[PDB]
Design a protein around this ligand. Sequence first.
Ligand SMILES: O=C(N[C@@H](Cc1ccc(O)cc1)C(=O)O)c1cc(-c2ccccc2)c(=O)n2c1sc1ccc(OC3CCCCC3)cc12
Ligand SMILES: O=C(N[C@@H](Cc1ccc(O)cc1)C(=O)O)c1cc(-c2ccccc2)c(=O)n2c1sc1ccc(OC3CCCCC3)cc12
Ligand SMILES: O=C(N[C@@H](Cc1ccc(O)cc1)C(=O)O)c1cc(-c2ccccc2)c(=O)n2c1sc1ccc(OC3CCCCC3)cc12
Lengths: 114, 43, 859, 70
Amino acid sequence: DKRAKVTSAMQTMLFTMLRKLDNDALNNIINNARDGCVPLNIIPLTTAAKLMVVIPDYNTYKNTCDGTTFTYASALWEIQQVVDADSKIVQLSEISMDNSPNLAWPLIVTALRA
Amino acid sequence: TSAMQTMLFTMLRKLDNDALNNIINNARDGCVPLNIIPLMVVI
Amino acid sequence: VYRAFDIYNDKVAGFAKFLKYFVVKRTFSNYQHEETIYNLLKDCPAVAKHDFFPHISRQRLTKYTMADLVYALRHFDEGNCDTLKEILVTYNCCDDDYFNKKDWYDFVENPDILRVYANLGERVRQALLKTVQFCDAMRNAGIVGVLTLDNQDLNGNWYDFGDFIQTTPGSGVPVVDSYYSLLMPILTLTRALTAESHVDTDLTKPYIKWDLLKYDFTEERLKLFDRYFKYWDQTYHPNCVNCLDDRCILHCANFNVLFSTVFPPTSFGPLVRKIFVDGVPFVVSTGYHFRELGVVHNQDVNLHSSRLSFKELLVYAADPAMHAASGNLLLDKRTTCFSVAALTNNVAFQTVKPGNFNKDFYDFAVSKGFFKEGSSVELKHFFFAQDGNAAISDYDYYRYNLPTMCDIRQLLFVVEVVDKYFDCYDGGCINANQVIVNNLDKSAGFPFNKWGKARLYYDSMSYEDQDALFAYTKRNVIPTITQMNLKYAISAKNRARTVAGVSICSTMTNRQFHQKLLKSIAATRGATVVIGTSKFYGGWHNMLKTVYSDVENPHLMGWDYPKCDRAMPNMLRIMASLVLARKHTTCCSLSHRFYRLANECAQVLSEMVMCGGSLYVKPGGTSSGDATTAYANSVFNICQAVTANVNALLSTDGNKIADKYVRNLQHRLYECLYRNRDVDTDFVNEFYAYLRKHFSMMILSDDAVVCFNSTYASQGLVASIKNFKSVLYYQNNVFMSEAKCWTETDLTKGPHEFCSQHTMLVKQGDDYVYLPYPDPSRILGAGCFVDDIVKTDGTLMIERFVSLAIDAYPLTKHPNQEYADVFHLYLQYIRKLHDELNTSRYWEPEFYEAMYTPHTVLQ
Amino acid sequence: KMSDVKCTSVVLLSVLQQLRVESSSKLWAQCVQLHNDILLAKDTTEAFEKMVSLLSVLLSMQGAVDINKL
Ligand SMILES: O=C(N[C@@H](Cc1ccc(O)cc1)C(=O)O)c1cc(-c2ccccc2)c(=O)n2c1sc1ccc(OC3CCCCC3)cc12
Ligand SMILES: O=C(N[C@@H](Cc1ccc(O)cc1)C(=O)O)c1cc(-c2ccccc2)c(=O)n2c1sc1ccc(OC3CCCCC3)cc12
Ligand SMILES: O=C(N[C@@H](Cc1ccc(O)cc1)C(=O)O)c1cc(-c2ccccc2)c(=O)n2c1sc1ccc(OC3CCCCC3)cc12
C-alpha cells in the first residue's frame, strides 16, 4: 500500500527529472572522461542552459551584470527577465545607483547560454 | 478572526500613551497616513 | 626573555616557554663535535651560516624562531599576545595600528584576521621546503638526530647542530615526528600551500587551468606529500581505503585535509557515471572524492538493469546526481558557500512570524503583583521575528568552518584516552528487527520529505530490505541530501534558528550501526557522559555527587564552544565517528568499517544542503538532525578536554613540578605522544586514572561541568579555563571569551549553570540535596508567549504549564521571595485553568514535590 | 512600563502579518527591525518612538480592520 505509493512517486520523480537533462552536452561531457566518471559539480556548470543570479545590492549588479550580456562559467550569457524579491518583473533601465533605494533587493537575474 | 485587532486596540487604550492615542484619534474619522513615520499626511 | 622550546631528554620533557641576527653562545668537545658535523653539512643551502668564533657564532638569524610562531598561535592569549603581534607586523602581514581595532584577534568578529594570518603562508611554505633540503643533506652525509622547531628560524634556515651524531655516509635517518606533528595546525591557519594553485608554484602567475573533468588527483597528492613530507616515516595512503586500521585512517585523512586546499573545489563531492536502466540512461554516483578520505569507488555498480527494486530506487532518489544534473546553474552572491545549482525557476524567501502573545496569563500575573516596574523578575525571552533573507544569512554562518589540520601525533594519543571514557559500554551492529525508533515523525529529508515523514518509509520497508540496505552501505557510498529549515524558538536574542532534516537513507543505516551503543550510554548512570539521566528523583543530586567523587581541593568550572555546530573541524568529527565504531570488532571487518565511515562523512559532514530553493555544498560542521550528533558532540567535548589537559601538562615546566609522580607522568606522556607509535595500553591507563582523580567531568552534548583539583590546576597540572581558550583557537578557529565561562570556589553552591539550569542546596527530610531550577524569565517568557498550536485545545496549554511548573517548583526554596512566588503563580494559574476545564494530582504541590525526592523514582 | 509596550509591539506585528504584509520585502524587513529593536529595548522612550513608528505603519494601510467603529 504505502510502499506502492512511495515507489510510484519516486519512479515518477526520477523519470520526470530525466526528461530535462539528457542531451548532446551531457553525453559529450561523459565521453570525455577516463571511464565516463566525472565530478558532479561540473555537470550543471558546463551543461546548464539556464543561469540564475541572485543579486544582493547594486554594487554587485555593476560588478557582474552591467549591459545586456556577461561572462561567467567560461561562457557568454544573455540576460532576460530580471525579477525582485517581491517577485515583480524589473526592467534593465531601472537598475541605477540613484534608483537603487526603490528596488526590492535581492534581484534574481536570469540568463541563457549564448 | 477580528478579535485580535479588538484586543490590540484595548491594549493600546490601556497604555494610554499620548502619541499613540493622538494618532489613533487622528485616524478615528479616517485621517490616516501612507508611509512609515521617520525616526506626509492626507488632510 | 621567554622563548618557546620543544624539549625531551632523560629528566624533563614538554613543549613550553623556558628562560634563556649573528646569535652567539658558549665546551671543547661540543665545539669540536659541532664543527665537524657542520662542515659535513655546510654546502646545503637549507642551513644558516655558522662561524667557529670557544663560541659557536651563528650568522644572520631572525628575531623569532618557528617554535615561537607555533607556540604563540597554539597558546594564544589576547591578554598576553605581544610576541604574536611583533611577528605579524615585522613580516608586513598587517599594520601596527591594526591592533587598535576591537576583536582583531577574533575569528567570528573581524574575519579579516584570516587574511592577515595568510600573509605568513608563503613564509611558512618556504620553511617546509628548506626542511626537506636540510633533511636531504643529513641523509646523504649520514647523520641521525631529532629535528626540533626551535632550531629553525622564520626564514627557514636551520642551526644548532649539536644533538646529531656521526654515522656511515648515505645512511642518515632524521626523526621528524615531533617537528611536523607540532607544526601541522599552522599549515592550514596560514594557508601554506596557496602557491601550489599557480602554474609553477609562483605567486605572481595565473591559477592552474585544471581540467574540469579531473577528479582523482592521486598522483598530485603523492607528489605534494613527496615534496613536503618526504621523510615523514609512515606510509601515506592518498585514498584512505588502503589503510590497515582507524589509526591509519586518521593519520592519512589529516594529510588529505591539507592537500585538498590546492585542488579546484569543483573536483570534490560525488563522482557520477552514466548507467543504463532498461536502456534509458541515468546519471548516478559511482564513487566519491572526499577532501579527507580521498577517492572511494563503489563496488556494486550495475548497468542495463531490467527493473529497479525498492532498495535500488531509494539509493537513486537520494543521490543528488539526478537533482543537480536537471537543475539550472546558480550564481548566488549573498553567500561565499559554493553553490551546485538551483532546482527551481525562482528563489524562495521564508520568514519567521512573531510570537503569539497570551494576554490571558499576562493579565492574571500582573494582578498577582508581577511585572511591577522595578522588580528582579521581568521579561527577557521572546519569539523574535526574521525577514526574508534570514535562512541564507543563517546558512552563510558556515563560512566560520575552515579546513583545519590537526596535530596527528597528539590526536592519536587523545583518541586512545578518549576511548577509555567509552570503554564501559557495549555496542555493535544490530539487525533491522532490533532497532527501537522514538519520534518517528522526524522529517525524512529532501526529496523524501515531499511524500511523508520517517514513519512512512520505516513502515513500507521490510526487515530484509532494511538489512540489505545496511549491507549495501558496507560496500558503497550513498551521498544523500539534507534540507535546512527555520524553527520557532524562545530566546533572549534575535539570531535565527534552523533545524536540519537529514535524509532517511542516512538515518536508517546509522541506527543499525550505532543504536546498540547509543542505548548503552543512555542507560548508564555514574559515568562521565550523562545522557538519558533524568534530573528528577534525585538524579541531579546523584549526578553532582558523582562529579564530586574524590576531588581533593575541588572547584567547579564551566565553559562554552562558540559557534560549535558551525566551526567544528572535519578531522575532529571524523575522529568522533571512529571512536563510536570501535565496538564493531566482531560484527564488521576493516573494509566494512571504512565504507561505514565514508557514509557519515558523505551524509552528515560534507553533504549537499537544500537551503531555500537551491542546492549548496556544506563545508563541515554538525547536523542537528542526526541522532548521533549529541553523542558525537560528547566525544568532541571530551577530546577537547583531554587535549586541554595534555597541553596544560606539556606546556608547564617539568623542573618546577614539585611532585615526583606527576613529573614521571609528564615525561612518559611525551614519549607516548611523539614517540612509541604503538598504543601503550599501560600508560593510557595511568593517564585515564590520573584524569579521573583530579579532573572529574560531567559531560552532556557540548556542555560540561568539571570538578577539578584546584591546587593542581593552579600550578598547571590540569586544564584551566585559559587552556580551553588556547585549544579552541588553533583547533576550532574560534575565540572563546571568558565572559561566558564561570568558575566556582564553593561546592555548597552547585554549578553556576549546566544545560541552562542553576543549582541550589536545600533541606529535605533532615538532609541537604541539590535541586535544579531555571532562570525565572524563561519560565515566565514561555508562559506569556506560545507558538500558536495550543489555541486549538486547552489541554495542550495545561501540559505546557504543568511542564513549566515541574521545572518551576524548586524556586520555592530560593531565598528570593519573588522567585519563590513564581511557582505559586503557575500553580494558581493551573488551578484556574483546570477549574475552567494522592500525589498524582497536578494541581497540588505534593505532585511537584515527588519529582525531586529520590525515595520514589516512579515515573 | 517595559512589559506593556513590548507585548503591545508583539501583538502589533501579530496583526500586521495577518494583513499580508509579508508581500512587501522592504516594509516587512523594516517592521521586523522595529519589532526586534522594541523587544531588545531597555529604555522606555526608545520603545515609545519605535512603537509609534510601527503603529503608523500599521494604521496607514487603508481597508484593514475598521478604526472608526472602535
Ligand atoms: O522547544 C522547546 N521548548 C519551547 C518552549 C516550550 C515548548 C513546550 C512546552 O511544553 C513548554 C515550553 C522553546 O523554547 O521555544 C522544547 C521543549 C521541550 C519540553 C517540553 C515539555 C516538557 C519538557 C520539555 C523539549 O523536550 N524540547 C524542546 S526543544 C528540544 C530540543 C531537543 C530535545 O532533546 C531531547 C528530546 C527527547 C529526549 C532526548 C533529548 C528536547 C527539546
Ligand atoms: O537552549 C535553550 N533555549 C534557547 C532556545 C532553543 C535552543 C535549542 C532548541 O532546540 C530550541 C530552543 C534560548 O534560550 O536561547 C534551552 C532552554 C530551556 C528552557 C526553556 C524554557 C524554560 C526553561 C528552560 C531548557 O531547559 N534547555 C535549553 S538547552 C537545554 C539542554 C538540555 C536540557 O535538558 C537537561 C535536563 C536535565 C539533565 C540535563 C539536560 C534543557 C535545555
Ligand atoms: O538540547 C536538548 N537536547 C539535545 C542534547 C541532549 C540532551 C539531553 C539528553 O538526555 C539527550 C540529548 C538534543 O538531543 O538535541 C534538550 C533536551 C531536553 C531533554 C533532556 C532530557 C530529557 C528530556 C528532554 C530538553 O528538555 N530540552 C532541550 S533543548 C530545550 C529547549 C527548550 C525546552 O523547554 C522546556 C524546558 C522545561 C520546561 C518546559 C519547556 C527544553 C529543551
